[PDB]
Amino acid sequence: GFLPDMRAAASLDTATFSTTEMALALNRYLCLAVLPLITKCAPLFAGTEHRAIMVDSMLHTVYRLSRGRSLTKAQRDVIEDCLMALCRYIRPSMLQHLLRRLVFDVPILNEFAKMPLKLLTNHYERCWKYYCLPTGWANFGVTSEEELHLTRKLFWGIFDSLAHKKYDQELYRMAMPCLCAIAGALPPDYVDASYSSKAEKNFDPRPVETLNVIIPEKLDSFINKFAEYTHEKWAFDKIQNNWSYGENVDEELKTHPMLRPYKTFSEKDKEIYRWPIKESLKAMIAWEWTIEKAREGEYNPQPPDLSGVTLSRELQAMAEQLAENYHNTWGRKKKQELEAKGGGTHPLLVPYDTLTAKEKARDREKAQELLKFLQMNGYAVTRLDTSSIEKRFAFGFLQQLLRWMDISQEFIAHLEAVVSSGRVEKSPHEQEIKFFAKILLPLINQYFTNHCLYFLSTPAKVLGSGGHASNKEKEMITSLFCKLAALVRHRVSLFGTDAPAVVNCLHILARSLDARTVMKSGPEIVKAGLRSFFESASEDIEKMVENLRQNLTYTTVALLPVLTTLFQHIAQHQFGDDVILDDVQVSCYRTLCSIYSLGTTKNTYVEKLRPALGECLARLAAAMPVAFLEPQLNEYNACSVYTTKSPRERAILGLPNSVEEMCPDIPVLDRLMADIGGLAESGARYTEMPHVIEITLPMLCSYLPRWWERGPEAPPPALPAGAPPPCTAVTSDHLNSLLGNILRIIVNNLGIDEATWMKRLAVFAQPIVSRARPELLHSHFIPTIGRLRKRAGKVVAEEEQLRLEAKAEAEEGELLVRDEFSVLCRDLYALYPLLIRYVDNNRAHWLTEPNANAEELFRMVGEIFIYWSKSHNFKREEQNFVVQNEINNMSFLTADSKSVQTSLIVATLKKMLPIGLNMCAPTDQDLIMLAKTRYALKDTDEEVREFLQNNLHLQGKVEGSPSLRWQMALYRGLPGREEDADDPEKIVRRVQEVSAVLYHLEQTEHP
């Protein structure tokens, strides 16, 4: 019904019938009736492997009709939409032929190449895992290395075509998604079978015109001999199939009709069969490789040509090229036949590369048969050496990117020249600038984003999209890191719109980088460049401190995020133990001294910038392996400069041979924590000392936790190594003091509304809230959370007073208490993560041995929860606080690490819920049930307390049922459990509390 229809349409599509009335009628009928039907049937096309050939045929002919001219734009759109909708469900195992045709038709990048690349990028987004993952995509076959080779050629061709063509906004804008999709889909460690490019010029198989030139007489006798050998190997194969050479002409004999022994085989048809071999060997001599004549001289041929096996690299490559010669000759004659027909196309007419395997198998069989016959009588060809490491797609793309960076330096130098000499907008190379700004940064960004773990992987740590980036690949991508670093360092004022992309690309270059291999036996040039970049950053921070007492739009805007991100990357790969061991930490000393010096100044600029400076110093402290608060303990540490340099070498490197006066601005950590404790006891605020919370607390909380492992408390695996005073001498007591000081500054700054920095004050408290002493609960958490509960109760009382009076001034006061609710919700979100981690640590201890203090904390935090449930205004203030301050992400992070109202229901109730149910007897569950029912009957707390007092006989007994007998047995077997809780007042108190908690929990889950 259908396939003949658009086949006839394609036949009528020719120029002679382009304007035919019936042809237009056919196109109209198809586009209005048949093609929409195909769109509707597109979902049903899944799993059509058994009709693969005809599905491929319909795809190809739909593409041909889409390119078919004499169509209205609406009809064009109908065909395009039908093709893309069908492709959305067509499996690539039938689609590879259409994909290769689109790959060879897209390089034009105009006319009928825009929608094609759109279809390609849609399919690549659909099958991104199919092409990149070495394992076959789930329920689909594994992608073919030939398909990856095709995508590689497509990538390079489209890239060079975009580079060559003039900058068109539409073209670049809609071509960048496809190019990025190809780059992401193609794995980096994939190596092509032939690490070269066709660079040629319905495919046109240009034949080999070698038939004009005769085969040289140095091998012509050989060529005739091989022709005889082929026509005799026909008989050989037949007789291996039990069919000897037959001398009779008839169709029943499956051998050659005139197939006789060469003694009796007439030579009249021997020339006829000889001519094709003449043409074959003329084709192969037409190239740069020629077979050698080490032999002498030159119906069953005993030596067989084992064409199925492999051989040497270049020889098998030229055999493949000779198969390509066969294919191009056959394709040219079939193309003459096709132009005689005037319609349709030949699927076999595709280039000898992206062929079907079956005719690839046939051409390979013929060529390798020829090659083996060459081999067994000594015929090897006489006329690069690229390792797979260089053949890698990542390696090739990095080569291209080096060439583009030298181009970048060139055109930015020209831009600097023209901006210094007035203004010259007209540039003979502005195409390069636009190409960069539109594709190169986005393309490299997407590529390193989707292969970040690949480049980050090492030969030892095999991981990522590929196995691992090569060592040379790692060192050259580090070189590119330094390259982009200098690129943004100089002429930063230019490409201001491109600056966010530049800084993001530099950040991801900092990521996906193995600096250990760069340090160890790496490129000394790249190492010197990165050390010089560190010194440049240090002197730029020095210029910043002197100025605050363009770099304004580069250091703060670009640098500080860049080296900050590099710092936490180095920290979380622990590169610092090697990368910052020597020649880098000295620059780190200078930077930290400069930051602590600028902290003394109270300029507005430094006060508004000190958050990011504190973050950067914390990251570098986490990434630096030497003691800066411990000058005396430092010389023991091996990463210190002094243990690696003699006094003279320290003098020549600028080291003054003493850590104390090399970093005199920051004193010893003992004096530092004494000062922090003194300030906490004095009880002042962020405004009073902005420097402390922004610098010293990042410093203190980045030194103590991660250097506790280096401290004596962490058991040293090596007793000889631990025998000398360790690099760090602090203990869990010191970390406890740090946590105490942080909580003191918190309990101070509950009151003020300007404490916006609670975000970090909790983020950094998260690493240190671990290893918390049990006494911390009663010493700090109980008073602080009690004060919070008192303040919340006062605010709820104010809310009730405002609610009981209906007045516009009452609503104005309601808005004021909304603001108060919002600020106390900021405080609540600051305090809750610490309590969450504390209870997650000490809950096992509380479950094993119950604590009355823990139960009291449970009761009062449940009171906080019930005020939350009662006050709807409190919930909406939490809502708007979270949405404006972006605390939803930090709530999620707190939940996953340990709606936006989940924080209170998970901390107040679900954290201590086992604690709450532990202290109540199993026999009290009946009282709990009846109390929850009486709550569901909407009665108040005092009234249900009276009901519990009335129901003293409603509680069950252990003898009543074996189901609760074991519960009672375990509950009394709890070591902390006694019979004192059996007092009726205690029973009714605990039952009412737990039942109210459960009542409010179930109301929250379902009103």
Partner: protein, 48 residues
């Protein structure tokens, strides 16, 4: 404290279990076997 009963708590005798014993033993043809089929044609003339 989560309401989850231990399994086989009220068992007096020890719970009997079963192990996958690896010993080749012949078993009849499954008529629903996805790959093999057995037919039973008999009574044909001049063929047993």
């Amino acid at each position: 404290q989560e309401g989850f009963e231990p399994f086989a708590i009220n068992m007096q005798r020890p719970v009997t279990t079963w192990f996958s014993k690896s010993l080749p033993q012949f078993e009849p043809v499954p008529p629903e076997h996805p790959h093999y089929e057995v037919a039973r044609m008999d009574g044909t003339v001049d063929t047993p």
